[PDB]
Amino acid sequence: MNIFEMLRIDEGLRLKIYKDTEGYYTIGIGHLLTKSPSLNAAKSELDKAIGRNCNGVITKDEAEKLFNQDVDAAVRGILRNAKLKPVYDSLDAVRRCALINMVFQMGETGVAGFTNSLRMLQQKRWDEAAVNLAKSRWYNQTPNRAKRVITTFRAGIWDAYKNL
């Protein structure tokens, strides 16, 4: 299992503009287009992102391209972030994928706000950090996904994704 396979389980693949769990306009493999309520604003962002007139619809191919950029940006964002970098560097390969997943879902900023859990993950207090991570809007709003990510940080193995 790898970062791409993991995120693809969590996000799914949709070739037509759709709404987030959040109500936001998205396409592909969890590629948020806009937080704006107009489908029209969303279509325009799409065409800007793909470089063609899409009419709200893309190919698998275009979806994967967007996904490669997003994962690359997520990693680079972690590496550039003063709060995230040190935790990332401290982690093993599997757990590194769990942090990347959180950053992709919620952005650098959002994850950098989980101060206490970050601190516990650095210290390798796995059970503690898993309890603290669960105390969040994140867990309450998307409990099955947060639970997968959390087990991944807790255990350091890919079992949560085996089932799936």
Domain boundaries, the chain: 1-164
Do 79 and 37 touch, CB atoms closer than 8 A?
Answer: no
3-class SS of residue 147 = helix
DSSP 36: S
Catalytic status, residue 20: yes
Known binding residue 4? Answer is: no
Residues in a beta bridge with 28: 14
Consult the annotation and say whether 32 binds a ligand.
yes
Query: Which strands sit side by side in the sheet containing 25-28, from one edge to the other?
Result: 14-19, 25-28, 31-34
Q: Active-site residue among 5, 10, 20, 61?
A: 20
CATH of 1-164, one of 2.102.10.10, 1.10.530.40, 3.40.630.10, 2.40.10.220: 1.10.530.40
Q: How far is CA 46 from the centre of its chain?
A: 19
C-alpha 107/C-alpha 83 separation (Å) is 13
Reported resolution, Å:
1.7
Give the tokens for residue 156.
């350091």
45 flagged as catalytic? no
DSSP 8-state assignment for residue 82: T
* Residue of 10, 11, 62, 70 marked active site: 11
Give the separation between CA 71 and CA 163, rounded to whole angstroms.
Answer: 23
Method of determination is X-ray
Provide the sign of the torsion angle of the four alpha carbons 155, 129, 164, 7, taken in this order. negative
